C-alpha cells in the first residue's frame, strides 16, 4: 500500500521537525518495510541518518532514492550536504549543480551551493546564490542568515538596521518554535541579540552532538576519584583540531612543555592529521603523550581512548569551530571538562563544566551569558607564543633618513653584533634606541628597499628586505623558525606617509560595523595628519569601507590598505603604526597580542560579550589601563590624544614596549604555573565530592 507508506513517511517528517530523530528513523524504516521502492523514504531516512553522524549509510540511501527516481532533485541536494560534511567539495558541487539542473527553481539547492562558494572564499558568488534562494523562497532563515554573514564579511552595510531587526526576529521565532537557529553560535556575537538568545543558540548546537552520540548507546564512564593511578600527577588532556599552523598553536604551543612533570602528565589529543609544520612537531615532542584522534574517526572508540588514559581534566580548545569533535566531550570520558582559549564564547552545553577566563574578560555581573562555571585566571586567560616565535622583535634600531621610532626599522637576533661593527651609531635615550646616521651603510639599505632588492650583505651580515621573507626562508615567514638575518621594515614598503600618524587595525573586516567606522572617522577628523591602516581581509570589502568612509567625511586617501601578509611580516610591520584602534564589536584576540608584541599601543572599548572584552583583559594584564575606554567618547578622546600629544604618545609607546617583557602577558611559564593552580583548584573541589562551582579565586 502506498497510503500506509505515505502516512509513515509524513509522520516521520513530523517527528523529525519535533526534534525526535530516533522516532523519525524508526518510522522511515517502517515505511521502507511496507514499500521498499519508496524514493522519498530513502532520501528522508538518509537526512536523519546524516544528522546522526551515519554518513556512509546516508549516502547509500540517497543513491537508492536516485536509482528509483533519477530526477529526484531533493535527493541530489541532500546528498550534496552529506558529501560536503565529508569534506568532498567536488562531489557536493556536482550534486548541487545537478539538482539545480533538474529544477532551476529549487531554492534549497541554490542556498546549499551558496554555502560552498562561501566556504571557498568566493563571497560574491555566495551572495548571488543566496539571493537567488531568497528570491525563490522569501521565508528561508538559513539563506537569509548566511547571506547576512556574507555581507558582514565584505562590509556591505546596505539596510544594515533592517538586517539586524530581521536576524533577531528569525532567531526569536526559531527559539520559540524549538528549531536549530540559523545563526551560528560564533556569528551571534556580531548581532544585537540578547545574552539569553546567544546562550540558547549555543545550547541548540550542543544538542546536535547529543544526536550523534545517542546512537552509540555507550554507558556513563567511571571517573578517577584520586591521583593514585597516576603517581600523584594530575592527568590533563588537551583536545584540539589545531595542533599545527593555526592561530591556536601560535598562542599555546609552548604550554604542554612548560607543565610541571612532577605534578602533571600532559596528553595532547589531535583532531587533525599532521601538516608537517614545526608547530605540530613541537607539541608532539614536548607533550608527555601525543594521540592522533584523526586515526580514530569513531567518537565511541575515540572517547574510549581518552578514558583509558585516565584523564582527570579534559580541555576543549575548539568550541564551535571547524575540526571540532564535541561528541567526545558529550560522552564525558573525564570527570572535569573545561573550555579554553580556542572559542570566544560559551558552549551552552551541560557536558562542559568550566570556561577558563578572567575577571576582566568575564565579570561576575555578566556570568549569566555562560552555561559553564567561571574559572578565573589571575590576570588574563589569553596567552601568546610571541616571545618564543618572534624574539627578533625584542630589540630594534632605526635609520635617520632625515628621529622617528617607526619610519625605517631594523630587527634581528644578531642586530646588536651588527651595530657594534658600525663606528657612528647614536644611542637615543627614549630601553634606549640605537640610531644609524644617514651614511654609506644607511644609503645601501634604503637603496635595497627602493630598488626592491631581496637582500644585501654588510660586514658579513645579511640585511633582508622585509617584503621578501618567503623568498629567503619560508619557515621564518610562517613563524615556524626565528629569522636569522637583519630585517628592514619601512613605511615606504606599505605606502604609509612618513609625516603622519598611522592608526591601524589588522583584523578581518567582518569585525568592523558601521558604528565602528563612524567612531574611526571622528578620530581621523580630529587628528589632521593621520591615516587609517587596514588589511584587504578580504579585498572585496575595500571599496565598501572606502565608500562608507566618504559618506562620513573621510577622503579615500585617509585610508590605506595592505594585503594580508605571512605571520612574521604581519607582526613585524605593526611596528610602523603609531596607534592600533581595536574593534569594539569583536576585538582582535590573536591579532591583539600581535599588535602589543610589536610595541604598539591599542585603544579598546570592552563590551558585554566575551569576544568584545578580550583586548581590555590583555591591556589590563599588560598594565595599560589608560588605553581602556568606558565609552565611545573616551575611546575617541584617548585615540585623539595619542595622535595629537606626541610626548604622551612617546610615553605610552615606550610603556608598551617595556611591558611586553616585564608584564606577565607574554610570560608562558608564569601562565602555565597559574593555569596549574587553577587545575588543582578544579580537582580538589571535585575530589572532595562537589559538583562544579565558580573558581573565581
Amino acid at each position: 500500500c502506498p497510503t500506509h507508506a505515505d502516512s509513515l513517511n509524513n509522520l516521520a517528517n513530523i517527528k523529525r521537525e519535533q526534534g525526535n530523530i530516533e522516532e523519525a528513523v524508526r518510522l522511515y524504516r517502517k515505511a521502507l518495510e511496507v514499500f521498499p521502492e519508496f524514493a522519498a523514504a530513502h532520501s528522508n531516512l538518509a537526512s536523519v541518518l546524516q544528522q546522526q553522524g551515519k554518513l556512509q549509510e546516508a549516502l547509500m540511501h540517497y543513491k537508492e532514492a536516485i536509482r528509483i527516481s533519477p530526477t529526484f532533485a531533493d535527493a541530489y541536494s541532500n546528498m550534496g550536504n552529506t558529501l560536503k560534511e565529508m569534506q568532498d567539495v567536488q562531489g557536493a558541487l556536482q550534486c548541487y549543480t545537478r539538482a539545480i539542473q533538474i529544477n532551476p527553481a529549487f531554492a534549497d539547492a541554490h542556498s546549499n551551493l551558496a554555502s560552498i562558494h562561501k566556504d571557498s572564499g568566493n563571497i560574491p558568488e555566495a551572495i548571488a546564490s543566496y539571493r537567488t534562494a531568497l528570491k525563490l523562497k522569501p521565508d528561508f532563515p538559513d539563506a537569509y542568515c548566511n547571506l547576512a554573514h556574507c555581507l558582514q564579511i565584505v562590509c556591505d552595510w546596505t539596510d544594515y538596521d533592517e538586517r539586524m531587526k530581521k536576524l533577531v526576529s528569525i532567531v526569536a521565532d526559531q527559539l520559540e518554535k524549538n528549531r536549530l537557529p540559523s545563526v551560528h553560535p560564533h556569528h551571534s556575537m556580531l548581532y544585537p541579540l540578547s545574552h539569553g538568545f546567544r546562550k540558547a543558540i549555543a545550547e541548540r548546537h550542543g544538542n546536535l552532538c547529543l544526536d550523534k552520540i545517542n546512537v552509540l548507546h555507550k554507558p556513563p564512564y567511571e571517573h578517577p576519584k584520586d591521583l593514585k593511578l597516576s603517581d600523584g600527577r594530575l592527568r590533563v588532556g588537551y583536545v584540539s583540531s589545531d595542533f599545527g599552523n593555526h592561530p591556536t598553536s601560535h598562542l599555546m604551543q609552548s604550554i604542554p612543555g612548560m607543565h610541571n612533570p612532577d605534578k602533571f602528565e600532559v596528553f595532547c589529543y589531535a583532531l587533525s592529521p599532521d601538516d608537517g609544520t614545526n608547530f605540530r612537531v613541537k607539541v608532539m615532542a614536548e607533550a608527555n603523550h601525543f594521540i592522533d584522534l584523526s586515526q580514530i574517526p569513531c567518537n565511541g572508540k575515540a572517547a574510549d581512548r581518552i578514558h583509558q588514559d585516565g584523564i582527570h581534566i579534559l580541555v576543549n580548545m575548539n568550541g564551535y569551530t571547524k575540526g571540532a569533535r564535541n561528541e567526545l566531550f558529550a560522552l564525558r570520558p573525564a570527570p572535569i571538562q573545561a573550555m579554553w582559549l580556542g572559542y570566544p564564547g560559551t558552549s551552552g552545553a551541560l557536558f562542559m563544566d568550566y570556561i577558563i577566563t578572567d575577571q576582566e574578560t568575564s565579570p561576575a555581573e555578566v556570568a549569566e551569558q555562560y552555561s559553564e562555571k567561571l574559572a578565573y585566571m589571575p590576570h588574563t586567560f589569553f596567552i601568546g607564543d610571541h616571545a618564543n616565535m618572534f624574539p627578533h622583535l625584542k630589540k630594534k634600531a632605526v635609520i635617520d633618513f632625515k628621529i622617528y621610532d617607526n619610519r625605517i626599522v631594523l630587527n634581528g637576533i644578531d642586530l646588536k653584533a651588527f651595530l657594534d661593527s658600525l663606528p657612528d651609531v647614536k644611542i637615543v635615550k627614549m630601553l634606549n634606541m640605537p640610531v644609524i646616521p644617514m651614511n654609506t651603510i644607511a644609503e645601501a639599505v634604503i637603496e635595497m628597499i627602493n630598488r626592491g632588492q631581496i637582500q644585501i650583505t654588510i660586514n658579513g651580515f645579511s640585511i633582508s628586505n622585509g617584503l621578501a621573507t618567503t623568498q629567503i626562508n619560508n619557515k621564518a615567514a610562517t613563524g615556524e623558525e626565528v629569522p636569522r638575518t637583519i630585517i628592514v621594515t619601512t613605511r615606504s614598503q606599505y605606502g604609509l606617509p612618513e609625516d603622519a600618524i598611522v592608526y591601524c587595525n589588522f583584523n578581518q573586516l567582518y569585525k568592523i560595523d558601521p558604528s565602528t567606522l563612524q567612531m574611526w572617522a571622528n578620530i581621523l577628523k580630529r587628528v589632521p595628519n593621520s591615516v587609517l591602516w587596514l588589511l584587504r581581509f578580504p579585498a572585496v570589502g575595500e571599496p565598501n569601507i572606502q565608500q562608507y568612509a566618504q559618506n562620513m567625511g573621510l577622503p579615500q586617501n585617509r585610508i590605506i590598505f595592505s594585503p594580508v601578509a605571512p605571520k612574521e611580516e604581519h607582526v613585524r610591520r605593526g611596528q610602523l603604526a603609531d596607534v592600533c584602534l581595536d574593534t569594539p564589536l569583536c576585538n582582535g584576540h590573536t591579532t591583539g597580542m600581535d599588535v602589543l608584541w610589536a610595541g604598539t599601543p591599542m585603544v579598546t572599548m570592552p563590551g558585554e560579550t566575551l569576544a568584545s572584552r578580550v583586548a581590555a583583559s590583555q591591556l589590563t594584564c599588560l598594565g595599560c589601563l589608560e588605553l581602556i575606554a568606558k565609552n565611545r567618547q573616551e575611546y575617541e578622546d584617548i585615540a585623539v590624544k595619542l595622535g595629537t600629544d606626541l610626548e604622551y604618545l612617546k610615553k605610552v609607546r615606550g610603556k608598551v614596549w617595556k611591558q611586553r617583557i616585564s608584564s606577565p602577558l607574554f610570560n608562558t611559564k608564569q601562565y602555565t604555573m597559574e593555569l596549574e593552580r587553577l587545575y588543582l583548584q578544579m580537582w580538589e573541589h571535585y575530589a572532595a565530592g562537589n559538583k562544579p562551582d565558580h573558581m573565581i579565586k
Binding site: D6, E17, K84, D119, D142, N146, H186, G342
Partner: peptide
C-alpha cells in the same frame, strides 16, 4: 598564502520530501 584563522563551516539545508 592567506592566514589560517578561526574558521567555521557554513550550515546547509536538508529538504524533507512529503509523499502525496
Amino acid at each position: 598564502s592567506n592566514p589560517p584563522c578561526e574558521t567555521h563551516e557554513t550550515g546547509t539545508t536538508n529538504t524533507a520530501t512529503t509523499a502525496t
